[model samples]
Target: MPLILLPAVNVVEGRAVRLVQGKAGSQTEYGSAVDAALGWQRDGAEWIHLVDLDAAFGRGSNHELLAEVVGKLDVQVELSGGIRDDESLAAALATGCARVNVGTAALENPQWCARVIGEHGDQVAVGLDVQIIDGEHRLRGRGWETDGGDLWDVLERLDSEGCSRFVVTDITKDGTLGGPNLDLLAGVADRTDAPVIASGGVSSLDDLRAIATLTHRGVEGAIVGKALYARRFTLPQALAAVRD
Candidate 1:
């Protein structure tokens, strides 16, 4: 299979924004979230990775608006951010998304993660946002503000619980446009049989092509944000680059 490029629209409050390392004051607003998703779809994006930053930060949520936007989009949508519990998970699933990503919950609530995986299967993917602390890769939760379990440990536990997919994001590379952490992706792919979606540090078309090469190793997709928003290359160009 080819590498799937998922253009991201991270919504905070109502507008679309991108944050460096998921920080509070590092936001760069683009425009309306709806317009952004529609724009990516118009540019030939097959999937849109929609995130609710407010919910991730434990503040408020844009659930209703995000659902509306999902309803409007023609392509597959992956709803993420603050989908921790049954209520939020139900709300996210109600958005008509192709899949929902659970981040903080996988670390803080393993039982719930297991149960959901058992119930929902591939529709629920664990978002393992990672940070390297003192040479160890650790999981970050609650909008990357707090530390959680060891990356490998949590991954193994989730995999045993029947996690069908994982969206792995290196917090260091996120929104930096430095480059995707190919080694981290490869390591995670080696550890889990579940397909991994590479996130963070996708800077150029070459980066997408590089990720595409890892499809055989189980890196199925990439969630691209800043690079696309910064216009490093158009979505169609990215799609064409990764096309087999």
Candidate 2:
């Protein structure tokens, strides 16, 4: 199969916004989360990488609005952010989303994440958002603010727990147009059997093509945000690049 292109609809305060490297103050509003999602689907996106930034930042509940957005998407939606505890997980899963990505919970409550993974199977995925802190690839949660744990350590445990997939992001390269963190994606994909979804730093069609090359290496797809919103390339163009 050709590499999948998941256009991201990151919601902050009920609106779609792009944040540079997950920073709090870096958000640039794009528009209504629902409209952006629908637009992506209209442009031929099969999967939507939908994130609730308000939830991630512990701001407030955007769940209702988020659910509405998910309900409006014609394609598959990978729901993420603030999906840590059972309540939030159930709520997110209730949105009829294709998959829910757990970041903080994977480290802080591996047992819980494992149980959910067992129950939900491939419907549960881990968002391995990382930061290079003191030269160590540390996992960060709470919107990439708090230190969750070591990257490899967490990956090894999740692998043992039969985690089906991962959304790997290098916090350093995310939303900066710096390009995808190819090394990080390849390294993690090589280390685990999970079907990895490359997130962060997709600058152009060439970057998508590059990620496609790693599809055989266990990179299932990529989450493209700022690149698409910035008009770096159209969704159709990105899809074609990966297909080629």
Candidate 3:
């Protein structure tokens, strides 16, 4: 299959925003999250990676607005951020999203995550936001602010628990427009049987092209956020570039 490109509409306080490396105060607000999702759909995006920053940071939630946005978009949406417990997970699933990504919950509450994976199957994907510290890959949780367990350890456990997919994000490269950490993606693919979706540091059309070449390695999709929001290239151009 061809490499799938998912344009992101990260919502903060009910508005579309992009942050530098998941930092709170570094957000660059664009506009309404719903409008952003619609614009991407107009650009021929098959999927929208919608994230609720407030829920991720434990400040609050844009649950109602996000549900409204999801309801308006015709394309598939993958919801992320602040999905920790039963209530939040139920709400996220109620939005009719194609899937929901679990971040901190996987690390802080592995049993719950494993149970959810067993129950929801492919609808639940684990977000492994990683940062290289002391030359070792470590996972980040609580909105990329807190350090978590080892990357390989977590991946091994999740894979065993039947995680259908893993969205790998190199926190250091996110929102910086530095090229993706291809090595990290390849590493994750090598260790797991589940298909991996690369996230963060998609800077150019060439970057998407490069990721497409890794389809054989189980890198099935890429989440393009800053690059699209920054106008590094148009979504149609990106779709055409990866079309085989």
Candidate 4:
């Protein structure tokens, strides 16, 4: 099924929301998280990729209100936050979320990833937050900052760690809404032999349609963020464009 990325952890400066790039120091507020999620739900979304922007970017974790948001939602909530260890993972899972995506720790702690994946199966996922450095593949974390490692090498590591589900986001395309990093996503899909969830650069219904086309190409689903919040198309329209 297609998914939407909910940027709940973002810090607000004024009327603009910041998309993370390069490092954790970067931030900009586009709009309120509640507004975006509600709009998506009203438009026919069944699940949301709830990103703890604050915790992911090293600012802080908004657990109190975020938990409240989760509690209030009838939709499935998949969280990506400060899940740096076992306790954090357990706590996030205990919230009754559909899933919890771990980025930094997925690379730093393979054993933990294996344990989670073994215990929870599809409920645990790893984010392949990738960036290009000097034309070579590089990995990024905590909101596209802080170098993790080489993308291919990191994938190899995760492969050995028993990782099964992946959330792949191209840093440059993230929040840009230019279009998806389809090639990058497809390439990762080719390599993994697992279900790859595409993220970033989705700007319209056409984008969703194109992603749906990739079901035969190995992409399992997608995460729509900026465009929905911008009202480019409602969730129902996007889903129809992709699915119908």
Candidate 5:
């Protein structure tokens, strides 16, 4: 498949929630994170974008719950959030997730991130979360609470380091459903030969279709969250929208 649709389910305090602009307290709880994963899987989702918000924010741990969710899932899970160190990376990959995504270490410790990519290959992917700070694209870390670095510089480094995949998110568009940041995704897609997974700002099937059009530019997949939970469209409908 040129494009794979991954349903996003973020866990904050063991409950599935969506935060506006990656804010700490803006979570709108829907239900159990495990149930959300199950529901998406039952609905024909081949992959699930699972996030541990507490870990992402450094508030606490959800390792047990995350293990249960991933353990029960019948589909692939792209585990993310709070994977900043070797210990965390080992734990996440041990959960049997299809892959583990790292953001903080990628910015805070470029060498470690590169080592991980080299050691794990396709099992690891970097989450390149960016925001416009004073008219410049800057990467965010620690649940988007800290400045990481310049987006272009980081991309160039990752590309040169042989990083194979990335999940690109425009934090401003995240959880707002304003629409995917086409320019950001397109630019990232154009710059890297690695498979790019588009995340955030999908409010409808049209948004998904728009993302689908970028597959030719190396956008291999997209993560849909609020739109699916909000009933903007069903999983099958979203999938059909992106079908060739």
Candidate 6:
């Protein structure tokens, strides 16, 4: 069954609980970082993607305040951002999150990612944070400054190593709402058949529908972020479109 993609809210490590585009968000409208959990809960969100931007980036910026939110939220919370090593992954899970998505770690160590997933089952995921630059795939990390690796090549290797689920982000189109990299997504899916989760560039309801093509093979779902924060499309409308 099709479902609406929930917002991938990033809790900045140092300060400011930012929404999409990494801007200061309104507690009343967007809800505080703490309240984002409540807002999503009220919306009947099937799942939520939470990230400690600082922790994932090596800044070590987040603290108990975020742990409290994750600890208290009554939802299937998938956490990401700056989770590079085994200890970090273990710590992220200790907060009672449903899962932890590792970005930098996947590029740096595929075996570690696979090991975690095998041990934890589907709770550990590899984040394919790619920026299609001149058709060359780049990844986002360390404040979106560093490159991870070539896209398809990395996908092939990750698939071989038992990475089944992926959070594939087209960095160039991220926050641009220009639609997802379906062509690249399909190409990667065709290559290895690892489940690809679309991660960025959802501008309108039509964009989500365009991704219906991904259902053909390994595409599982899309991670709708900027568009949700901008209110360009409501969660209900998005889910209905995918379901339809």
Screening candidate 2 with a backbone cut-off below 3 angstroms (N, C-alpha, C), the clashing residue pairs are: none
lDDT head-to-head 4 vs 5, winner: 5
lDDT per residue (tens digit) for residues 1-244 in model 4: 5433332223232122446343334454556665655556666677777777667767777665556656777888777778878888887887778888889887677677778878877788888888876777788876666788888888877766677778888888887778988778878888877778888878888877777777765687788766766667776677667666
**Residue-pair clashes per candidate:** 1, 0, 0, 11, 0, 2
Candidate 5 ranges beyond 4 A from true positions: none
lDDT of 5: 0.92
Listed in order, each prediction's TM-score against the native is 0.98, 0.98, 0.98, 0.87, 0.98, 0.86
Error of 5 at 84 (Å): 1.3
Of the two candidates 1 and 2, the one with more favorable lDDT, higher being better, is 1
Give the per-residue lDDT digits (tens) of candidate 5, residues 166-228.
999999999998999999999999999999999999998888889999999999999999988
Residue range 55-117, candidate 2, lDDT tens digits:
888888789998998888778999998998889999999999999999888988889999998
Candidate 1 displacement at residue 18 in angstroms: 0.4
- Considering TM-score, which of the candidate structures 4 and 5 is the better prediction for this target? 5
**lDDT for model 1, on a 0 to 1 scale?**
0.93
lDDT of all predictions, in order shown? 0.93, 0.92, 0.93, 0.72, 0.92, 0.70
Candidate 4, which segments miss by more than 4 Å at Cα?
A: 1-31
lDDT of 6 at 192: 66
Q: Which window of 10 residues has the lowest lDDT sum in candidate 3?
A: 22-31
For residues 69-160, write the lDDT of model 6, one tens digit per residue.
77777777778876777777878888888777888777777678768867876777788777676767766655466677777777777777
Specify the poorest-scoring 10-residue window by lDDT in model 1: 235-244
